[PDB]
């Protein structure tokens, strides 16, 4: 009786939200950006190839200096690269080799990683002893660690396969806030530029916008037909793009609270693993299962170019803070740095 | 390059030297994925042979590393990509429980037909055979109630039952095994094979059965690259 009545009210609320989004869907992003000229053909060359990983690379993250990057592979090795020279700055042996994510702290003093061991391990890069040591192991998730991102040297946000995200106090080792509401494994998260909000994509084909300080879900974004694997905020923080296993990328707007554009092609039938934006946000770069990285025009939904330099799955990618280059990691155990030429 | 850059580049080459040494140790060790249900008893086999539970048992100076991804739920379509290059999958079922056999058959079919497990052989264990023998000997419950095709099943002439085994026990035991093998032969095209076995909760020969099965998996790998198969 009471349960049946309540679940009927949820359907009424869902229709109210759907009607509200349809009311403000006066135009389409495609119609708005029809007049502007296309970006043309985007040609990028492999400037660097980072060799040394002996297994599938699962994650990479640029440092804020746009020169150092950290990559994670399932050979149980965290490697920090000097991308300008391809020099290896550090090689961190992982206690558990089943790593799924890695993060570089914005200060550059710490890196984080974690995988099927359900632990987010914090590594101190600046020690008087001259070696990288584990500073914290964040326990509390009951599923695998899928993504992690530093807010500062003391705070980090993790998404897990136990359907929850958590905000951690690194110094005390306790999760101050737990973000619940996903009905599937959360596969990715992206931080807003001001680090006051973050979006997460799960295997329930939905993306939720979370308030870091308040600790609740502000908005829920649906429209994908399969698990969401990747998510990335737009550079101004008012939008984000997702990538799913249904071979599509979608651009959702926070303030309009709805999808704005779909990035799919008839030839593309493979899942998407990673998404990122260029510094101006005009380009959306997506990694695919078909060994390629497709550069999309974010405004016009046109495939601007292709990064074809890997012989296995493109598992991860990232664009530098200065926008100078894009790194692609792959299951072929290589990292490649791309940019164009005049 | 400056003096400090040459020193930095030398440090990088010393890092590469240690990375190569670590990659040589990983080639000698065989990785196994231990899958099964709660009632399967997969925790018993590993204990006798001895987040993520990792076990290392050595047979004839050969190192086996077995992993059990405990917890979570039946939604394992995500982390199964990690074990795309394991030597074998050790799938354990409970033959005594006829009620949940169809779930095991459905579970085994998903693993066999998984996109990321198209080249991984499966070392199938049908655990708790002593319990199954007692259950068949008691005769209180009949397999034909759950599987109608068991009434029209006859033991193949090629079967070689162990001495001291009741023919009724053999007929039921070989019917459960054929259900899993029928799934394996449906697809695969010879890329991966299933190695069914019958074990018990007190069996001490489980480590060698994996050893003999992993030898066939490695041997098939070597013959393919020599173009001998």
């Amino acid at each position, epitope marked *: 009786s009471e349960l049946d009545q309540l679940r009927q009210e949820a359907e009424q609320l869902k229709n109210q939200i759907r009607d509200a989004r349809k009311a403000c869907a006066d135009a389409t992003l495609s119609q708005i950006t029809n007049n502007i000229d296309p970006v043309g053909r985007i040609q990028m060359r492999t400037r660097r190839t980072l060799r040394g990983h002996l297994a599938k690379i699962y994650a990479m993250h640029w440092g804020t200096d746009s*020169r*150092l990057l950290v990559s994670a592979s399932q050979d149980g090795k965290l490697i920090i690269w*000097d991308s300008y*020279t391809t*020099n290896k*700055v*550090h090689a961190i042996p992982l206690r558990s080799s089943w790593v799924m994510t890695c993060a570089y702290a914005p200060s*550059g003093n710490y890196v984080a990683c974690g995988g099927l061991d359900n632990i987010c391990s914090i590594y101190n890069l*600046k020690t*008087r*002893e*001259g*070696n990288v040591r584990v500073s914290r192991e964040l326990a509390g998730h009951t599923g695998y660690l899928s993504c992690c991102r530093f807010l500062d040297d003391n705070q980090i946000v993790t998404s897990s396969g136990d359907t929850t995200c958590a905000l951690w106090d690194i110094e005390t080792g306790q999760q101050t806030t737990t973000f619940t509401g996903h009905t599937g494994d959360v596969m990715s998260l992206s931080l807003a530029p001001d680090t006051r909000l973050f979006v997460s994509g799960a295997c329930d084909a939905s993306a939720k916008l979370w308030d870091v300080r308040e600790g609740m879900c502000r908005q829920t974004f649906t429209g994908h037909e399969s698990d969401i694997n990747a998510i990335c905020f737009f550079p101004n923080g008012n939008a984000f793009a997702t990538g799913s296993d249904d071979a599509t990328c979608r651009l959702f707007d926070l303030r309009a609270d709805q999808e704005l554009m779909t990035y799919s092609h008839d030839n593309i039938i493979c899942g998407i693993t990673s998404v990122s934006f260029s510094k101006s946000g005009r380009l959306l770069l997506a990694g695919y299962d078909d060994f390629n990285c497709n550069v999309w025009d974010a405004l016009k939904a046109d495939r601007a170019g292709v990064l074809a330099g890997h012989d296995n799955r493109v598992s991860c990618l990232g664009v530098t803070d200065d926008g100078m280059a894009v790194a692609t990691g792959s299951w072929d155990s290589f990292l490649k740095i791309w940019n164009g030429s005049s | *390059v*400056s*003096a*400090e*850059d*040459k*020193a*930095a580049a*030398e*440090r990088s080459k*010393m890092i590469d030297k240690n990375l190569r040494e670590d990659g040589e140790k990983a080639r000698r060790t065989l990785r196994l994925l231990l899958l099964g249900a709660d009632n399967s008893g997969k925790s018993t086999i590993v204990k006798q042979m001895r987040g993520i539970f990792e076990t290392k048992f050595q047979v004839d100076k050969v190192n086996f590393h077995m992993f059990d991804v405990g917890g979570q739920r039946d939604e394992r379509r995500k982390w199964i990509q990690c074990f795309n290059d394991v030597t074998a999958i050790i799938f354990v079922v409970d033959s005594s429980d006829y009620n949940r056999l169809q779930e095991a058959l459905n579970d085994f079919k998903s693993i066999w037909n998984n996109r990321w497990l198209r080249t991984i052989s499966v070392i199938l264990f049908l655990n708790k055979q002593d319990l199954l023998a007692e259950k068949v000997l008691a005769g209180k419950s009949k397999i034909e109630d759950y599987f109608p095709e068991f009434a029209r099943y006859t033991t193949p002439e090629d079967a070689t039952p162990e001495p001291g085994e009741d023919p009724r026990v053999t007929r039921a035991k070989y019917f459960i095994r054929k259900e899993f093998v029928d799934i394996s032969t449906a697809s695969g095209d010879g890329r991966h094979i299933c190695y069914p076995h019958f074990t018990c909760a007190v069996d001490t020969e489980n480590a060698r059965r994996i050893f003999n099965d992993c030898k066939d998996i490695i041997l098939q790998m070597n013959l393919r690259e020599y173009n001998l198969v």
Partner: single-chain antibody
Amino acid sequence: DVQLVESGGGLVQPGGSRKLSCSASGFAFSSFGMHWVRQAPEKGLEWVAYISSGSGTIYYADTVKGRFTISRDDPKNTLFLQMTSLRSEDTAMYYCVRSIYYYGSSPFDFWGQGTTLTVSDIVMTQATSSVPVTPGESVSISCRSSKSLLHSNGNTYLYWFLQRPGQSPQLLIYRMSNLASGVPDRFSGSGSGTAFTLTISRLEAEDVGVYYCMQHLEYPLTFGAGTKLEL
């Protein structure tokens, strides 16, 4: 804590041989390159030798090349300096210096206490030998180089050290602008090309000492004469 203890020094006859040892504790010794730096009595610092991490690269100063041999024992965390045919020019305090080299590292960050031995090229110039100072007042120290220390990679390989009376040198500024760990923010390094300045805002009693500028653009590493601060 990080420690570097030198031993084996003492009075030796001319033409003799002596073995200096540097025991390291509290840090990953095998990860650090090591230098020997000596300082003649009432004189400035002079770099002697260098052995890299992994013992693959070894450099010597010309005044000691062929007579000194530098070696390390990574399992025992001991640094050695075998000296032969010792001359009266070798009478100095020999310092054991650790230095690690990667992008953003701080070489020459820790020095040993030193051991005293008594026997019976880019030019770095510090023309101002001494500077009278008063507490709380800003002081600037100038250093000059015959060659430009700015490399094509953007680094300017200039280092600043402070040797308080009775103490081993301590790193203040590495690569001409970066502030070493544990150094107050009042120290600031500014330079361009061949001219460099070390600015000390709000000078204190602890800042009193001799300041050395060292170049790390190429070997042999050379030090300036040194500028002394007195109250």
